[PDB]
Design a protein around this ligand. Structure first.
Ligand SMILES: Nc1ncnc2c1ncn2[C@@H]1O[C@H](COP(=O)(O)OP(=O)(O)O)[C@@H](O)[C@H]1O
Ligand SMILES: Nc1ncnc2c1ncn2[C@@H]1O[C@H](COP(=O)(O)OP(=O)(O)O)[C@@H](O)[C@H]1O
Ligand SMILES: Cc1ncc(C[n+]2csc(CCOP(=O)(O)OP(=O)(O)O)c2C)c(N)n1
Ligand SMILES: Cc1ncc(C[n+]2csc(CCOP(=O)(O)OP(=O)(O)O)c2C)c(N)n1
Ligand SMILES: [Mg+2]
Ligand SMILES: [Mg+2]
Ligand SMILES: [Mg+2]
Ligand SMILES: [Mg+2]
Ligand SMILES: [Mg+2]
Ligand SMILES: [Mg+2]
Ligand SMILES: [Mg+2]
Ligand SMILES: [Mg+2]
Ligand code: NA
Ligand code: NA
Ligand code: NA
Ligand code: NA
Lengths: 304, 304
């Protein structure tokens, strides 16, 4: 079984009616919805670096899609379709069946179509997914735009996936293996959030991209960070390391005025929202604990 | 480090046809009116899609070229690319040459680099996503070939496959620096009845058209456009390079006699050769000096 049978056997379910031309030709074709901009991103997952080597093939496929839908959500946009480029050393039916199942389970959960890609042989498992979304023209939430006085907020919990990586077997491994892209929240933040980013590297480092892009600073309250009860029971130091520098969260961190935060809380959401601090004028990220300044040194995930 | 790599090598101005380029979670494109998005992605694996010692400039060039080739194969105009690279080491001399190759190909064809992803991985792997636009409904597909249509191919075929086995020969330039036939693809909109780019080998790639169109073809072996160097080698090897070599990135297309006459009236920037015609019998056969010529051909396939 070779390249072309592989595509047909695992990556060629019937295309959505809303896709002008799916898998089968030199490119895919999409008809843009009217009065909307294309939103596009791509992220690579390297075996043994973005996930443990023994990660289940289903989880590998899920996360490959999930982390890229998360980057669409971080813009306020609605995801539409993906391309899948996979390089793998060996043809393993069992692995490919479970991997394609994770691809399609994530796509199906968020209404996304798989419309093309590329399948190659290479010595190390390497997956690049390109994601495409659409957004009302002009309405994208940027990493710039945060203003002094805006609240700093984050969805869900932070630190779960990082704790899980260090405690494989623990229930919190599910947050490492199966992050949830906050797609509907991202769309609900269109027109409310003044800036936004998804927490892939670590909350402090990813907030920092907003602070640099907006030429502002932020003061965070450590005891308001939303952590899992398990992390609430570990020592404070390691708890805040996990929460602020763990990464792999794929939650949304955003800024928002107090008035728009009240409108956001009136909405029906599928995820917890926590206000964790405020944007300030001084161009520094600082931490507060029990009403006093808390010095804290911290580094997020960077390749190389 | 990762963030310095992007800023130093992959962050040239955006440019004008791009609402939001590099620096956010996704890129933003305002679609031109009355046009469909054309999108594709191809992966290059070091030591497999190019000799390990290929210059970084040629690696960058080809990474873009092979993807513009799949846009050209639809009759579409290329617009922008994303670049996903997994690198074992940070090498500034390599990165300078590679990024220069990326941009030299983009600049030659009016294409913007609007985003991507940079990761560490044990083996050099590059996936470019290419985006183009086509007047709605006017894409040239792999289906559509009709009995009586001529089979044509641009340029020369076999050059790159010869160069790969004769590294150091002048024809290595066609391996290292294929030319995507962008303008020709555009000029075949409304003229070609079907089209594919010849990445795997003319016989196999024409085979994809034959299967999608439910027709066959008869090719005239002495009409195949080969380099003078291949004209001087034994004819069996000549035909294997020409028909199963791959890596040509020429356009193979079908066209009515009537529309072929119109194509010739255009001032084209590449040679065009009529090499045979579509027939009812659903087989690819070869003819040489007026008689059937049996030929066993196997084009490129991963895991084969
Ligand atoms: N893993 C994949 N998932 C989805 N579609 C894929 C995948 N690999 C390839 N494809 C699709 O299968 C078709 C054949 O792929 P390919 O032979 O690589 O095309 P080309 O030779 O034009 O680059 C294309 O339509 C491509 O987008
Ligand atoms: N090699 C590259 N070429 C072009 N753009 C790139 C490349 N690598 C990353 N980018 C861009 O740099 C920015 C930051 O990348 P990254 O930190 O990986 O984003 P994210 O964490 O949201 O996935 C993005 O805008 C991305 O599109
Ligand atoms: C085996 C293993 N080691 C380490 C990690 C942690 N990790 C890997 S990548 C990463 C950051 C997210 O990946 P990146 O490539 O930076 O994604 P992007 O910012 O492009 O979305 C983290 C915290 C992991 N998930 N698995
Ligand atoms: C070192 C090396 N070995 C072999 C080849 C030949 N080769 C590699 S890939 C390929 C076909 C084109 O690659 P593929 O991944 O199938 O591209 P696609 O069809 O997706 O465009 C050929 C002929 C090469 N260029 N370099
Ligand atoms: Mg092609
Ligand atoms: Mg990224
Ligand atoms: Mg990302
Ligand atoms: Mg391909
Ligand atoms: Mg990152
Ligand atoms: Mg992001
Ligand atoms: Mg291709
Ligand atoms: Mg191929
Ligand atoms: Na990305
Ligand atoms: Na990444
Ligand atoms: Na492709
Ligand atoms: Na390929």
């Amino acid at each position: 079984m070779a390249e072309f049978s592989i595509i047909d056997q695992y990556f060629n379910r019937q295309s959505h009616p809303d896709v002008a031309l799916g898998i089968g030709d030199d490119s895919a074709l999409i008809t843009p919805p009217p009065n909307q901009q294309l939103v596009i991103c791509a992220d690579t997952l390297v075996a043994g670096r973005h996930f443990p080597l023994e990660t289940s093939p289903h989880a590998i496929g899920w996360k490959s899609v999930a982390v890229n839908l998360s980057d669409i959500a971080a813009m306020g946009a609605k995801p539409h379709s993906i391309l899948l480029a996979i390089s793998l050393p060996q043809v393993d039916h069992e692995w490919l069946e479970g991997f394609s199942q994770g691809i399609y389970d994530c796509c199906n959960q968020f209404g996304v179509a798989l419309i093309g890609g590329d399948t190659t042989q290479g010595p190390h498992l390497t997956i690049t997914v390109t994601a495409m979304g659409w957004i009302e023209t002009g309405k994208a939430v940027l990493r710039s735009g945060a203003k002094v006085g805006d609240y700093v907020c984050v969805s869900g919990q932070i630190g779960d996936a990082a704790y899980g990586l260090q405690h494989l077997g623990h229930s919190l491994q599910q947050r490492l293996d199966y992050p949830t892209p906050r797609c509907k929240l991202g769309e609900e933040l269109k027109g409310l959030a003044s800036s936004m980013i998804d927490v892939s590297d670590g909350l402090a480092q990813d907030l920092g991209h907003i602070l640099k892009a907006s030429k502002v600073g932020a003061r965070l309250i450590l005891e308001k960070l939303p952590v899992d009860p398990v992390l609430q029971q570990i020592e404070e130091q390691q708890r805040w390391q996990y929460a602020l520098a763990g990464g792999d969260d794929y939650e949304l961190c955003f800024t928002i005025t107090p008035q728009n935060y009240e409108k956001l809380l009136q909405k029906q959401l599928d995820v917890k929202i926590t206000m964790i601090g405020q944007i300030v004028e001084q161009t520094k990220l600082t931490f507060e604990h029990l009403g006093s300044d808390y010095p804290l040194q911290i580094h997020g995930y960077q390749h190389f």
